[PDB]
A paper describes a structure:
UspC from Mtb is a 441-amino acid protein that has been previously identified in bioinformatics analyses as a putative active importer of carbohydrates across the inner-membrane of the Mtb cell wall. The uspC gene forms part of a putative three-gene operon, uspABC, of which uspA and uspB encode the membrane-spanning subunits of the transporter, while uspC is a homologue of ABC transporter-linked solute-binding proteins. The fold of UspCNt follows the architecture of periplasmic binding proteins for bacterial ABC transporters, consisting of two subdomains or lobes that enclose the putative carbohydrate-binding cleft in the centre of the molecule. In conclusion, our data strongly indicate that Mtb-UspC is a carbohydrate-binding unit of the essential UspABC transporter system, with a substrate preference for sugars containing an amino group at the C2 or C3 position.
UspCNt readily formed crystals in vapour diffusion experiments using a commercial sparse matrix screen. Phases were determined by single-wavelength anomalous diffraction data to 2.6 Å, exploiting the anomalous signal from bound iodine ions. The structural model was refined against a native dataset (apo tetragonal) to a resolution of 1.5 Å. The UspCNt structure determined represents the ligand-free form and the model comprises residues 34–441, plus six additional residues of the partially ordered C-terminal affinity tag. UspCNt crystallized in two different crystal lattices. The tetragonal crystal form (space group P41) contained one copy of UspCNt in the crystallographic asymmetric unit (ASU), whereas the monoclinic crystal form (space group P21) contained two copies. The subdomains are joined by a central flexible hinge-linker that is localized around residues Asp145, Thr321 and Gly379. The molecular surface of UspCNt shows a prominent cleft between the two subdomains, which is characteristic for periplasmic substrate binding proteins of ABC transporters. The cleft is lined by several aromatic side chains, which affords the potential to form π-stacking interactions with carbohydrate moieties.
Residue numbers in the entry: 34 to 447
């Protein structure tokens, strides 16, 4: 029989990406035939709880995915290999999310990239707007704003009147300008970062601050006063509403991430493209998130783990994760396979990546986060419906969100 290979295990939570890794590792083992890599797919819902007990019990895989909201505890407690290499070919946003105490604690694998603005070029042309104009847009609570008049021109009622025109009837809107809504990823986290505010800090909700107040007041205005985005009752409990209106030819600008590329490309019958995120008072600040693979410091085969991590961080190894156009390599030299997948389909994905070259805001998360996000949602729904006031809602919602998180964490300790 042939020689026994050293077996390295890799843990993750995403089924299609697990399938791409299996392809990547088959290629690794052809050139490194002394090592066999096995993937271990564990469901996301219990991933971090099960990792914590496996690592504590000395039964964790050799390599495992981490997110920004959970890596620190592992790094601080010596559970992770230091990643000792230059980071120049790795997405900086992802490197930054796994750097602690001056050390990088995982090999960047995937990025969400940034948020951008899908546009219906036929509706822009109908309004006399060139697609290039959508890259010049600025939102502001002050007189320097240019987003609001653009959105008003792109919002039209059944009689053909735009949102800026006397006699416009918001009850009879047939086409919206935009998708402002109670939507953290596509909308409000970007508005908060673009106003210099935070959403989460040190594991707690922290969105009751001046930057966030400005962001939410602007969004409440777009929806309830300008009528350039759908009423909040259409979007508060219905995360696909705006994408569905965009696909139906009823929305000019649709701000979203690369997660909307596949459904838009599959169904849109009109001419469409992607433009930059609008700049706010602190600049164009997008939400982003990344995933890195950490090496288990307790591995029985550390040299093999280091070889497998070098492969995973390489052009060839990481290209496998992007070649179906469904996930974005964090290795910069591997990103062309994702760009080329999309450009073959007529989509230039540049704006999702260009926005990362600036200030950013992290996607929030962490232990007990889901409980707190669930708690704030009814308060945010009323705010986006134009009821009460932004300041009093944010105060109350933050207290409710933190209380729900803390209960969940207390229940876990006991």
């Amino acid at each position: 029989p042939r020689g026994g290979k050293i077996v390295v295990t890799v843990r993750l939570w995403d089924e299609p990406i697990a399938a791409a890794y299996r392809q990547s590792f088959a290629a690794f083992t052809r050139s490194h035939p002394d090592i066999e890599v096995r993937t271990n797919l564990v469901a996301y819902s219990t991933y971090f709880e099960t990792l914590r007990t496996d690592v504590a019990g000395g039964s964790a895989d050799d390599i495992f995915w981490l997110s920004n909201a959970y890596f620190a505890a592992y790094a601080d407690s010596g559970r992770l290999m230091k990643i000792q290499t230059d980071a120049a070919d790795w997405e900086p946003a992802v490197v930054d999310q796994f750097t602690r105490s001056g050390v990088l604690w995982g090999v960047p694998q995937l990025t969400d990239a940034g948020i951008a603005v899908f546009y219906n070029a036929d509706l822009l042309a109908a309004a006399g707007v060139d697609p290039t104009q959508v890259d010049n847009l600025r939102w502001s609570r002050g007189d320097d704003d240019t987003l609001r008049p653009m959105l008003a021109r792109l919002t039209v009622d059944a009689d053909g009147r735009t949102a800026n025109t006397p006699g416009f009837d918001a009850r009879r809107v047939r086409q919206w300008g935009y998708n402002a809504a109670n939507d953290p990823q596509a909308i409000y986290l970007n508005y908060i970062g673009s106003a210099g505010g935070v959403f989460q800090r040190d594991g707690k909700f922290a969105f009751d601050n001046p930057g966030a107040i400005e962001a939410f007041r602007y969004l409440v205005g777009l929806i309830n006063d300008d009528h350039v985005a759908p009423p909040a009752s259409d979007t508060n409990d219905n995360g696909d509403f705006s994408r569905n209106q965009f696909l139906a030819g009823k929305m000019a600008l649709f701000q979203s991430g690369t997660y909307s590329l596949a459904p838009v490309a599959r169904d849109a019958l009109f001419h469409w493209g992607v433009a930059m995120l609008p700049a706010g008072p602190a600049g164009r600040v997008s939400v982003t998130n990344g995933i890195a693979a950490a090496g288990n410091s307790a591995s029985k085969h550390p040299d093999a783990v280091r070889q497998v991590l070098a492969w995973m961080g390489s052009t060839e190894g990481n290209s496998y994760l992007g070649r179906h156009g469904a996930a974005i390599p964090a290795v910069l030299s591997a990103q062309p396979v994702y760009f080329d997948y999309w450009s073959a389909r007529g989509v230039d994905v540049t704006p999702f990546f260009a926005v990362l070259n600036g200030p950013r805001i992290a996607a929030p998360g962490g232990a007990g986060f889901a409980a707190g996000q669930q708690a704030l949602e009814p308060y945010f729904d009323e705010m986006f419906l134009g009821r009460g006031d932004v300041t009093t809602t944010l105060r109350q919602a933050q207290a409710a969100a933190n209380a729900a998180t803390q209960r969940k964490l207390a229940a876990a300790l006991e």
